[PDB]
Design a protein that fits this description.
part of a larger assembly, 9 chains, A mainly alpha, B mainly beta, C mainly alpha, E mainly beta, G alpha+beta, C: mainly alpha, three-stranded antiparallel beta sheet, about 40% helix, about 5% strand, globular, E: mainly beta, Dna Ligase, domain 1, four-stranded antiparallel beta sheet, 1 helix, 8 strands, about 5% helix, about 35% strand, elongated, binds magnesium ion, binds zinc ion, DNA-binding, RNA-binding, DNA-directed RNA polymerase I subunit RPA190 (chain D), DNA-directed RNA polymerase I subunit RPA135 (chain B), DNA-directed RNA polymerase I subunit RPA14 (chain A), transcription, DNA lesion
RNA sequence: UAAAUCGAGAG
DNA sequence: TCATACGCCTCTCTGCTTATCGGTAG
DNA sequence: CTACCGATAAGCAGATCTCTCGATTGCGTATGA
């Protein structure tokens, strides 16, 4: 697999890493699922369901 | 259609930095990897120097040079480029989305 | 490689020009067949006009500037017809030079314009000469 | 005279810009005369 | 973590191919064709594993067009009805660095290999005796001197010693 | 080709170049030493010309990429030759360049100020500043020869900056036909002036020229009558490859700038110094085994000719390497004059024969020596030169798929824009129609009909190129496959595609016909398709005979079947027969009825016809 | 790292773009352009691109595209290329057939 | 040697035989039709050297 | 149309080499459908319908210890006309290694033929 | 199933 | 006596390119 | 007087559309049997 139907031709990264504030780490995981179902799966994904609560609370 | 599409249409792999067509080849995965295509020129020997290192059929270790793209070319162009390399002449193909 | 570009100038695929105008006129040879058959065009005027549909060919066209320039050039060469060729100091170049023949109605070759004027002078035909001239210029375009 | 012209072409490092139809045919690119003398763009009404 | 956050946003410029099926919804087509498969995947160019995307922009081929108009132009390759274009997206990538300390949990243990799970998402590889005698728990600090990237998911291997 | 497999990257431009011996020794998969192809058992000998790492050979999986015979692209190799040899491609250039050189000062035998004149002229003209190039010569006005040069450098740089600044020439330079003409004229004249005189006006110590014999030999004589007398005041031999390379490299190192501006026409990033290792191949390149595969009779096996030539090169190289070891051992102690003389003579003629071997490997004509023979083996240059060469035979025109050829029989019952396709054609040629919400019924019917009943389908190409052929399936299998034609695809990567049915050439398609020689445009039109289920020959109306210049003299004309909608629409509108009514030669018509319809009209339009 | 590569190409691209107010090419849609647009539109429909023109049981994508062009709803934009590299951007809607 | 001569047509000799051509001295007597067969025993060839020169006198 | 062919199994038989392949059938598990259009010996019958993909003669190859069959090499169906068992002139009484098969094809006048 | 040369040739 | 693997065994047109022999400067 | 520049004459280099059938494939030689 992994043809042009599913992968970009070039993945050049512009500007630079621009998040070293260490304080604005929120607002993405609480909003990514908002723009997702309101269904990406290849065969099985489970780390997305246990990667958000680490910064906030406990598993 | 009458010269390329239905005669010798080949989706070969081409490196942007190398600019050559046949200098690339498929890496052999070790365990649970993906056999991508990498250069035999961009990569330098581990002696002369994982995600950074890919191996070949002879068991040698090659590091770097894992940039390339697929372009639609006739196979006869590849044969001509090989024959030119027999003359010592090298052709560099400039890829648009560099 | 040499092919006509979007400026109606033929030039090699490199870009090196060969001529600015395709033969000085840029009319397709396959369509040059009945642009001299004045009698046939006049006889079939109504069918030709229905085919051309001049009504839909106004909002994307300009007529007055090219027509005025062509008339000025025509009267200039009429005043300047009989004299040695090396003395013909051109003040107004042929209309094809500036106005795009596919964008300005009335921009036609000097040979075609001369033949059309000679025909309209010699032959006096209910359709008027003005509508016939407009249709012939649309045919040339 | 493929040998004659190739020698001059490589000796002065002559670079072909893929303009002539024959070069496009050899490389295998859409020709530049006629239907391939322009490009076509798709208009999409995104938000 | 140990006074380190990472998860650095990185705008990217990518050359996507848009199917003619999504010709009336180009942005959703682009995300579902390229960006959605890029999630939960370790991309070397981005640096690490990607947790999502945000901020779709179409770098259309019309230079005279305003940078905010609702219609955009997509270049169609000659031999295919598929459309190619550039795009701008914001990628959120968790970036490990060699020579640092990371906090992770312990899930699977064996006699030879010791499994460490950084935020229960970084797969890697029966209480016994420790230096202090405490039974092995899920909380510990390790080193990232060895990284394996030949499997399905990247792994972190190291030792307590520096 | 496949419509459902697009590609983004395309080759914008191609630039030629030379191969440095470092990079090819860096990229190669294996060397080549033993001049033997196959052993007694037929297994590929390790390190042989069919080495297992140079591409898969027969069943042996290639030991560089680990793929099968049809999956291995075929990697390149290299032979580490121990002696540089003159390139027959660049032999004339080398001979001309070193002919006009001085041995002592290692500069050109022309003056050192014309050197900078031509360097600046070429540098400035490379940017398309033609008028400035000719205006530079107006800066004319021993130790004064350096003050003049500083003026030329300022004038050159100022003009180029000015031309770049105002948009007259982008930094990449402007290479057009006229600048190419001026480059050729100036460079040829400058070389001719180099070859003109014989006394070196840079140090005074002039040097003897070199002669030629064939295209592998160089001769000189350092001793003359008067040229001897003068060089003391100014204080048929053999020329060896290593020392001629040495003097070449010395000259090039001296004149780097001029060699750069004379060995380059695109003035951008020409940093790479033009060295002397551009006409000597210390490392030769062997094509991959996939490209060097031998022929195969029903039983006989014949050796590849290029492989045989490479084996001969290996034989001479191994003989030379063996003899040099004999040279070294006999070098331990001074040996009899006869022994050292004979071994050095053997080295001399071995170098001569390896030069002839490389010359024959490249070009067949340059080979010397033939009394009876059987056939002169063609070289690599012979494979790309004549009409039978690779260019005119496999790139300007190739054999095509989805195309037929048969005799044409006339038929005044087709509307002068169709063709009569016999059913034997209509059961072979196919079009890859993709399934969809409106083509489902017709394509399902074609699939149910199958490859034997026209109209029908032969292959059902899935989204992921899994061509399911219908040749060997029964009616119930075909019916089930048709009923499973339009279903959602589980794979997301293929969820944007749908299956393609290789349906037979229906009645609505369009083909291209051609009656060789295709002298002019009308000899290749596009006719519509009409499937007459009676005959076995193509059926063509009478109006097309005049245009094709065809006959019905048992003429056979081709029939191409375009496979993508671009080609279909392009032939249906631009190349269709109706639009070709008038030939572009003079505007006269080229169609119309010919022989009996004319007399029928004469009889029917007369007055007696009531 | 990448901006200097990108900004230079967009400036060049915007340089060649001829403004809409001063495009002096043929207003009519040429035969080549008609053929290319019809073929590309037919390819899109074959690849399941949405269509806003009703289909009367037609099965030929080329005929569907011809109907679209006759009714003038093709969602395609041409790009006329001048020899230097300058390009003008006409639209099918403002183009005149024949 | 004679069998080879008749089978291949090519002539090998060390005297030239005062003949311009070297090959094409025997033809396979085709049995396609009796007309062809009888016509085989009657033609005269000017020589294979005359089949290339551009003059037509 | 009368077309003949000669299938030779002594082409690779070197001077004095023992006979490598004979005409006929071996003891292997060859399909019974081969018995159609092939006689008890290696030669086929006379006047049988043979098309592309249809065996002509069956020869026993001891080198592979198997019986192999040849195949027709022409699209047009033909009828076997003659099967000439041609012998050898040498003193050695070798088995059948050379045979000649003659084919007949119905060349009925079809359209496109030249009169 | 190769590859080259010669003859018969067809348009 | 004698067989297969090595070793060679004479009726056409356009240029371009270089050698040799006349004239002129110093 | 002698070096530089052209002006012939000889040699060098290269030219004078597709396809199908059939036929054919080297002497010399030199040592191990
Ligand atoms: Mg004919
Ligand atoms: Zn590379
Ligand atoms: Zn390989
Ligand atoms: Zn010197």
């Amino acid at each position: 697999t992994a043809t042009t139907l599913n992968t970009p031709v070039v993945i050049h990264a512009t500007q630079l890493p621009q998040h070293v504030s260490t304080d604005e780490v929120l607002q993405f995981l609480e909003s990514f699922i908002d723009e997702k179902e309101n269904t990406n799966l290849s065969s099985s994904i489970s780390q997305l369901k246990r990667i958000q609560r680490d910064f906030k609370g406990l598993p | 259609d009458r010269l390329l599409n239905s005669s010798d249409y080949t989706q070969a792999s081409v490196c942007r930095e190398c600019g050559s067509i046949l200098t690339t080849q498929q890496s052999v995965p070790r365990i649970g990897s993906i056999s991508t295509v990498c250069c035999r020129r961009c990569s330098m020997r581990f002696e002369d120097a994982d995600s950074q290192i890919w191996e070949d059929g002879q068991g040698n270790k090659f590091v770097g040079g894992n940039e390339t793209t697929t372009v639609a070319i006739p196979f006869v162009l590849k044969y001509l480029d090989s024959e030119l390399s027999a003359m010592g002449i090298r052709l560099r193909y400039n890829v648009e989305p560099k | 490689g040499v092919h006509v570009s979007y400026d109606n100038s033929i030039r090699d695929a490199d870009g090196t020009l060969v001529q600015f105008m395709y033969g000085g006129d840029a009319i397709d040879i396959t369509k040059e067949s009945h642009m001299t058959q004045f009698e046939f065009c006049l006889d079939n005027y109504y069918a030709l006009l229905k085919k051309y549909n001049p009504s839909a060919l106004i909002e994307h066209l300009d007529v007055e500037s090219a027509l005025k320039y062509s008339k000025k050039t025509l009267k200039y060469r009429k005043k300047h017809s009989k004299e040695p060729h090396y003395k013909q100091s051109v003040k107004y170049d042929p209309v094809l030079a500036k106005y795009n023949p596919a964008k300005y109605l009335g921009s036609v070759s000097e040979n075609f314009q001369d033949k059309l004027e000679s025909f309209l002078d010699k032959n006096s035909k209910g359709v008027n000469e003005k509508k016939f001239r407009a249709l012939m210029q649309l045919k040339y375009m | 005279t493929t040998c004659q012209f190739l020698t001059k072409a490589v000796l002065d490092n002559e670079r072909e810009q893929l303009d002539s139809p024959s070069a496009r045919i050899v490389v295998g690119k859409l020709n530049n005369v006629g239907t391939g003398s322009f490009d076509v763009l798709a208009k999409v009404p995104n938000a | 973590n140990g006074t380190s956050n990472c998860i650095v946003r990185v705008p990217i410029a990518l050359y996507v191919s848009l199917a003619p099926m999504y010709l009336e919804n180009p942005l959703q087509g682009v995300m579902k064709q390229h960006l959605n498969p890029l999630v939960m995947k370790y991309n070397n160019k981005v640096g690490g594993v990607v947790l999502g995307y945000e901020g779709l922009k179409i770098l259309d081929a019309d230079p005279l067009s305003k940078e905010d108009t609702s219609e955009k132009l997509i270049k169609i390759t000659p031999d295919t009805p598929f459309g190619f274009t550039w795009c701008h997206v914001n990628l959120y990538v968790w970036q490990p660095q060699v020579g640092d300390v990371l906090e992770g949990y312990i899930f699977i243990q064996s006699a030879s290999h010791i499994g460490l799970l950084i935020h229960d998402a970084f797969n890697a590889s029966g209480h016994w005796v420790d230096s202090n005698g405490e039974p092995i728990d899920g909380k510990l600090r390790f080193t990232v001197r060895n990284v394996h990237t030949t499997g399905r998911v990247v792994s972190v291997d190291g030792t307590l010693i520096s | 080709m496949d419509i459902s497999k697009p590609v983004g990257s395309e080759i914008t431009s191609v630039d030629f170049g030379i191969l440095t011996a470092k990079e090819i020794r860096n990229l190669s998969a294996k060397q080549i030493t033993n001049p033997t192809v196959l052993d007694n058992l037929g297994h590929p000998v390790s390190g042989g010309l069919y080495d297992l790492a140079l591409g898969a050979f027969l069943r042996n999986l290639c030991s560089t990429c680990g793929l099968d015979e049809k999956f291995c692209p075929g990697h390149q190799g290299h032979i580490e030759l121990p002696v540089p040899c003159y390139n027959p491609l660049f032999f004339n250039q080398l001979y001309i360049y070193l002919r006009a050189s001085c041995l002592f000062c290692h500069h050109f035998r022309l003056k050192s100020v014309e050197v900078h004149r031509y360097a600046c002229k070429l540098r400035l003209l490379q940017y398309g500043l033609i008028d400035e190039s000719y205006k530079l010569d107006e800066i004319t006005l021993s130790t004064l020869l350096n003050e003049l040069k500083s003026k030329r450098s300022e004038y050159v740089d100022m003009a180029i900056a000015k031309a770049l600044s105002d948009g007259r020439t982008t930094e990449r330079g402007s290479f057009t036909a006229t600048v190419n003409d001026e480059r050729k004229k100036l460079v040829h004249e400058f070389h001719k002036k180099l070859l003109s005189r014989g006394k070196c006006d840079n140090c005074g110590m002039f040097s003897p020229k070199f002669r030629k014999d064939g295209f592998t030999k160089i001769f000189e004589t350092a001793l003359n009558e008067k040229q001897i007398t003068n060089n003391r005041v100014k204080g048929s031999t053999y020329i060896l490859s290593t020392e001629v390379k040495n003097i070449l490299d010395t000259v090039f190192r001296k004149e780097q700038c001029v060699l750069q501006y004379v060995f380059h026409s695109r003035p951008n990033l020409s940093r790479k110094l033009v060295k002397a290792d551009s006409f000597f191949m210390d490392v030769l390149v062997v094509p991959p085994t996939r490209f060097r595969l031998p022929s195969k009779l029903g039983e006989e096996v014949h050796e590849n000719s290029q492989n045989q030539l490479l084996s001969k090169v290996l034989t001479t190289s191994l003989l030379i390497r063996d003899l040099n070891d004999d040279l070294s051992k006999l070098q331990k102690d001074k040996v009899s004059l006869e022994d050292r003389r004979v071994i050095f003579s053997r080295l001399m003629n071995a170098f001569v024969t390896i030069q002839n071997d490389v010359n024959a490997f490249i070009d067949s004509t340059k080979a010397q020596g033939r009394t009876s023979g059987k056939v002169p083996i063609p070289g690599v240059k012979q494979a790309l030169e004549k009409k039978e060469g690779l260019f005119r035979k496999h790139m300007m025109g190739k054999r095509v798929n989805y195309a037929a050829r048969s005799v044409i029989s006339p038929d005044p019952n087709i509307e002068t824009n169709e063709i009569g396709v016999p059913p034997v054609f209509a059961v072979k040629l196919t079009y890859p129609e993709p399934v969809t919400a409106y083509n489902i019924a017709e394509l399902r019917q074609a699939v149910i009909n199958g490859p034997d009943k026209w109209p029908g389908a032969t292959q059902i190409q899935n989204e992921d190129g899994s061509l399911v052929s219908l040749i060997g399936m029964s009616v119930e299998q075909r019916k089930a496959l048709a009923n499973q034609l339009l279903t959602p695809s589980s794979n997301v990567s293929t969820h944007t595609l749908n299956k393609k049915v290789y349906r037979h050439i229906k009645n609505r398609d369009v083909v291209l016909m051609n009656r060789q020689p295709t002298l002019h445009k009308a000899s290749m039109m596009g006719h519509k398709v009409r499937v007459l289920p009676n005959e076995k020959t193509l059926r063509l109306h009478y109006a097309n005979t005049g245009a094709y210049n065809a006959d019905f003299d048992g003429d056979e004309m081709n029939m191409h079947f375009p496979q993508n909608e671009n080609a279909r629409a392009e032939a249906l509108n631009l190349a269709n027969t109706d639009s070709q009514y008038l030939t572009p030669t003079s505007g006269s018509p080229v169609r119309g009825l010919i022989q009996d319809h004319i007399s029928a009209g004469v009889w029917l339009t007369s007055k007696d016809s009531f | 790292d990448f901006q200097q590569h990108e900004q230079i190409r967009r400036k060049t691209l915007k340089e060649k773009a001829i403004p809409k107010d001063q495009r002096a090419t043929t207003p009519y849609m040429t035969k080549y352009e008609r053929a290319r647009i019809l073929g590309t539109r037919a390819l899109q429909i074959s690849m399941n691109a949405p269509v806003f023109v009703d289909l009367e049981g037609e099965t030929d994508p080329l005929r569907i595209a011809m109907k679209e062009l006759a009714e003038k709803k093709i969602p395609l934009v041409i790009r006329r290329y001048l020899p230097d590299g300058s390009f003008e951007d006409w639209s099918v809607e403002e183009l005149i057939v024949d | 040697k004679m069998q080879y001569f008749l089978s291949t047509g090519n002539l090998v000799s060390q005297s030239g035989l005062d003949l311009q051509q070297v090959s094409g001295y025997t033809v396979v007597a085709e049995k396609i039709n009796f007309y062809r067969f009888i016509s085989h025993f009657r033609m005269v060839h000017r020589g294979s050297f005359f089949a290339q020169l551009k003059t037509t006198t | 149309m009368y077309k003949t062919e000669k299938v030779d199994l002594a082409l690779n038989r070197n001077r004095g080499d023992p006979i490598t392949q004979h005409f006929g059938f071996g003891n292997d598990e060859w399909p019974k459908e081969w018995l159609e259009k092939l006689d008890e010996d290696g030669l086929p019958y006379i006047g049988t319908y043979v098309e592309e993909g249809d065996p002509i003669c069956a020869y026993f190859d001891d080198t592979l210890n198997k019986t192999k069959i040849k195949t027709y090499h022409s699209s047009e169906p033909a009828y076997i006309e003659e099967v000439n068992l041609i012998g050898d002139e040498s003193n050695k009484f070798q088995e059948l290694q050379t045979v000649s098969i003659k084919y007949r094809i119905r060349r009925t006048p079809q359209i496109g033929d030249k009169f």
